[PDB]
């Protein structure tokens, strides 16, 4: 006799994503040597941590000092869908996973002249209230103030503080408010700093994670 087998129904269907490997046919082929080719990357999120890309505020990456005093320079949604991200590598990447968790880094590089000085504040407004339009109200959230000097750049981490352990990259229609709060960045004062640009970029944080790959897009 030969070995009796049961060909189970509902098993064997093709599947665009199965973890097997097709049989081969053309063998004994030897690839040209590619030892030490520059710039290899192993996991996207590495480049995402290493290279911060720019945020957008109506066609521009920077924010402009309207005038001296307590002005709210910017305020936005904490979603990878956010309009301000859009041109951002992080968002372009996140668009292929349903969920995420993690810290996001904001970078503020002051571009002004040597005689231009300013002081800023950035805060993370968790949901539950409405994003305050002035520092003194925002002074109660996790925030950080800082002035200009020799060091052009200032980095700041946006904390993952949510009910669930993961959250969606995607944005639901039913959501009016950004499920994860906002981050508003103010100016406290300045002098001779009007007109001057404070270009901002964002990179992935250390514990930032992307999970559950999905292909929702046109074709």
């Amino acid at each position: 006799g030969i070995f009796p087998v049961a060909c189970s129904d509902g098993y064997g269907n093709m599947v665009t994503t199965d973890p097997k490997t097709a049989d081969p046919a053309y063998g004994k082929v030897y690839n040209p040597p590619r030892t030490a080719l520059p710039g290899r990357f192993t996991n996207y999120l590495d480049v995402a941590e290493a290279c911060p890309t720019f945020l957008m505020f109506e066609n521009v990456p920077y924010v402009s000092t309207r005038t001296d005093g307590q002005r709210l320079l910017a305020k936005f949604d904490v979603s990878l869908a956010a309009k301000h991200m859009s041109n951002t590598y992080l968002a372009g990447l996140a668009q292929y996973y349903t969920q995420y968790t993690g810290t996001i880094n904001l970078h503020f590089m002051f571009t002004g002249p040597t005689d231009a000085k300013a002081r800023y504040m950035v805060a993370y407004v968790p949901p539950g209230m409405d994003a305050p339009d002035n520092p003194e109200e925002a002074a109660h959230c996790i925030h950080a103030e800082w002035d200009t000097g020799l060091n052009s750049k200032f980095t700041f981490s946006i904390p993952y503080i949510s009910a669930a352990d993961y959250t969606y990259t995607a944005s639901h229609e039913a959501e009016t408010t950004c499920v994860q709060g906002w981050v508003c960045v103010y100016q406290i004062t300045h002098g001779k700093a009007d007109a001057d640009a404070l270009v901002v970029s964002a990179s992935a944080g250390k514990d930032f994670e992307l999970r559950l790959p999905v292909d929702a897009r046109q074709q």
Partner: protein
């Protein structure tokens, strides 16, 4: 980089670069950005039946101008160029006498204005750069880059390795490196800034190797 004396009102962070019999001092460095690697792959492949050679003489500085940065040109204004472009001297001579060749780049871009200007440029080098969209200027930082910002520095320095799907190229019809410079913050001039900024480049072909000597009429 760093300098002494103590502190002062002027500049420091001095750095001298040298390729061949050519130097380039800069009392306002911000360091040097390194390419996609620290050392090029094997310079002697099978594709050259090991008839390749290297020329130390080529590895020297050569200057070439870029453009004038003025307050007019605002965000995204970009000036690109593919290296080598028109090559002169020793380096140039190689291209006319060898069928195939390879080398990386030592680029030092210098936008000399004055510390009272505002504004900021982004200088990068790109592999196989083929026309970026407006949106993807925002993700230009994925390339070996370095900013020039008047309050801080005058010079941007980036060193980069040769790349390509081929160990050796025919520059006469494929160059991988494209040096670009883009405005990110339009130039501010204020009371005492400089009216406009002239942007130049100091370049050196690094680790130049050539193979396949061609015939010659002169």
């Amino acid at each position: 980089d760093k300098k002494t004396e103590e502190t002062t009102l002027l500049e420091d962070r001095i750095l001298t670069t040298r390729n061949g019999h050519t130097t380039s001092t800069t009392q306002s460095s911000v360091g040097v950005t390194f390419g996609y690697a620290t050392a090029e792959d094997s310079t002697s492949g099978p594709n050259t039946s090991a008839l390749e050679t290297r020329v130390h003489q080529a590895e020297r500085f050569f200057k070439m101008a870029l453009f004038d940065w003025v307050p007019s040109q605002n965000f995204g204004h970009m000036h690109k160029v593919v290296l080598p472009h028109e090559p002169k001297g020793v380096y140039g001579g190689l291209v006319k006498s060898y069928a195939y060749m390879r080398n990386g780049w030592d680029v030092e871009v210098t936008a000399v204005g004055n510390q009272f200007n505002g504004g900021c440029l982004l200088v990068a080098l790109v592999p196989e750069m083929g026309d970026i969209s407006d949106r993807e200027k925002y993700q230009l930082t994925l390339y070996p880059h370095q900013f020039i910002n008047p309050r801080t520095n005058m010079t941007a320095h980036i060193t980069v390795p040769y790349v390509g799907v081929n160990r050796y190229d025919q520059y006469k019809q494929h160059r991988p490196w494209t040096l670009v410079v883009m405005v990110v913050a339009p130039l501010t001039t204020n009371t005492a800034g400089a009216q406009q900024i002239k942007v130049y480049a100091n370049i050196a072909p690094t680790n130049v190797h050539v193979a396949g000597e061609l015939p010659s009429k002169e």
